[PDB]
């Protein structure tokens, strides 16, 4: 069968959520194991505390932890981060910085890629985050895949919304308050069918 | 006086407009010359009829056109274009690639760069339009000005909106129907009084 | 058969004689099909939008002008609204090639901006990987990003692409194929 | 006076000699105050956030991590969340410089992601113009990019910064400080 892992960070909740959307979708195309992994925390146990981020983060708890090398098991990667400034979050960037040995060994060519985000405001990021994302993949020899315009929910134009041709998103606020909408829930779920089903044609085919 | 320069192509007027909110937002500082210059279109005549936008063109006909040697006479230049699948538009990509000499001259450096964008959709492009953009900035030895997050216009939660921290921005729709919003005509005229301020702090300082 | 169309801008010839090197890389597969196509401003034929919808995968090949596409094939792809509204690239694989004057003047940046335009399409995104021993050559001046091959023609235009970029390219026809035709052959 | 921090991570030493070049040449100018900072996980002191609001410009350095800032530098810029709402470094200059295993691994893609969350803080991007001869430099294997200095440390982190790389950093600490000081006596 098809593995896809899906691969993030989150604090507040948002990634997580999307997180789930994207499985959902991957789930539709049959033949596939789909594996939810998110990355470990950096923050502080105190700040952590302090922040609340201790309490949103137990809502998903018991999902297990992403390593470097489990990312080899998978036929399909799709990777969530918040933006931090443009750029992805200080977790995901450790945990990538530490697939040196992945690298040398090719375990991730020819594997599919693909990433979703969240940010605070409609244009802070919500593709830069997603290009700039792409740049590692192509370090590890991976063939990108985004969201096709096919997907009607890219060119909404009476709600705001996440959602780009580079990969799904969803907006959280200021103060990280507005939690996924319909619209860019459905956005997601149509990207994790449409990587599964690619990863699927590729799979297929040693 | 400081020598502001607005360069952009517009098909349906949008980026006309928030040039002309660009404008006004730079005619604040003081002491400052703002000069709109448009570029040359490459639509064959007949196209040109047949789509209407030789009609559309022509509320902003008397707008002059802007040439490569120009810009060496601006202390800053502001450009604009509607987005192209998450590029500049190709003629404003010939009208840059015709700068040639004016690189290998030194013309533009030193000199403040700055950009603003038009799409169809809420996240085609509304970024990487403007960081693409960038990047030919950068090779003509420019500093760069964005948006910064002062403006309470980037931060809008409430309304559907353009405008990013890489420079300002509006939606047009899928149809090319909808107008510019106060809100990002507020961001575009706040980015021309801040590029302006910088330019005005740069240029009494040779 | 997978079908591979190479549509390229060329000034000097360097971009040109990249193509030829990934067509042999390409052609090396076996029942690859490769086509050369050349954007309007010899004996190539020109691209039309209406074809591109004929490949299993597209690779693009453009001189920079400062780290940017060139307006040949901007004005091109801008051309592509149909093929666009009707969905015909989504899916295809698509790869980007390059040339420079300079060694860090738009190799990679050229390559990852035209990303974007194939990612608007709905297209499959293929550079080259590492297993490429070219990429990490420390003893020539050389082109050849992970993003997509590059070659560098110096400021004159003078320097021929050298043997590890062409290289370079011909592993990216081969890998780009490689992967055109498992997903043609999986419809 | 004006106040040029340079903020970086350095594993081998080779973004450690670079930022030596590019302070060595900011304080060519003249009435310019250079502090080194370093990033946290030696004599360098630490950056701190806080520290950054007193800078009239930051040049920052990194190696790449697969085309992007490494964690460490990333992990810093995360903390600048109270920078950020304050508008603490808004009008200020910004700039990077850093370095690569392989020619054009990101060589730039490094430095232009980097520019992203310069101008989230609303700062002032300035790379490196092309009146510094080192960038069109075709005879030897150099960094050294319109987007901001480089270096290539090679595969196994051996290769020395060339001289040619060397200068290329001291000529954007010099350009960076002199647009810094034209600003900062123009309040």
Same mark, same amino acid.
């Given at each position: 069968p098809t593995?896809?892992?899906?691969?993030?960070?989150?604090?507040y909740?948002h990634?997580?959520? =999307?997180?789930?959307?994207? !499985?959902?979708g991957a789930?539709?195309? &049959?033949?596939?194991?789909?594996?939810?992994?998110?990355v470990?925390?950096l923050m502080?146990?105190?700040?952590?505390?302090?922040?609340?981020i201790?309490?949103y983060?137990?809502? +998903?708890?018991?999902?297990?932890y992403?390593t470097?090398?489990?990312?080899?098991?998978?036929?399909?990667?799709?990777? &969530?981060?918040?933006?931090? +400034?443009?750029?992805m979050?200080?977790? =995901?960037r450790?945990f990538?910085?530490?697939?040196g040995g992945?690298?040398?060994s090719?375990?991730?060519? $020819?594997?599919?890629?693909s990433? +979703?985000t969240?940010? !605070?405001?409609? *244009? &802070? %990021?919500?593709?830069?985050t997603?290009?700039? +994302?792409?740049?590692?993949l192509?370090?590890? $020899?991976?063939?990108?895949? %985004?969201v096709?315009?096919?997907?009607?929910?890219?060119?909404? =134009?009476?709600?705001?919304?996440? $959602?780009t041709?580079?990969?799904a998103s969803?907006?959280?606020?200021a103060?990280?308050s507005?939690?996924?909408?319909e619209?860019?829930?459905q956005?997601?779920?149509?990207?994790?069918? *449409?990587?599964?089903?690619?990863?699927k044609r590729?799979?297929?085919n040693?």
């Amino acid at each position: 069968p098809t593995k896809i892992q899906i691969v993030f960070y989150s604090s507040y909740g948002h990634i997580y959520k =999307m997180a789930e959307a994207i !499985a959902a979708g991957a789930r539709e195309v &049959g033949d596939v194991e789909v594996t939810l992994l998110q990355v470990p925390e950096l923050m502080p146990e105190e700040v952590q505390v302090k922040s609340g981020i201790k309490g949103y983060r137990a809502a +998903f708890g018991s999902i297990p932890y992403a390593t470097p090398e489990v990312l080899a098991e998978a036929d399909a990667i799709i990777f &969530g981060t918040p933006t931090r +400034f443009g750029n992805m979050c200080s977790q =995901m960037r450790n945990f990538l910085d530490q697939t040196g040995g992945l690298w040398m060994s090719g375990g991730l060519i $020819g594997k599919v890629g693909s990433v +979703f985000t969240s940010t !605070a405001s409609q *244009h &802070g %990021g919500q593709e830069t985050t997603i290009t700039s +994302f792409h740049t590692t993949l192509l370090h590890h $020899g991976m063939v990108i895949v %985004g969201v096709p315009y096919s997907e009607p929910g890219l060119t909404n =134009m009476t709600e705001i919304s996440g $959602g780009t041709p580079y990969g799904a998103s969803t907006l959280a606020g200021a103060d990280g308050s507005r939690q996924p909408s319909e619209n860019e829930l459905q956005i997601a779920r149509f990207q994790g069918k *449409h990587v599964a089903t690619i990863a699927k044609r590729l799979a297929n085919n040693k």
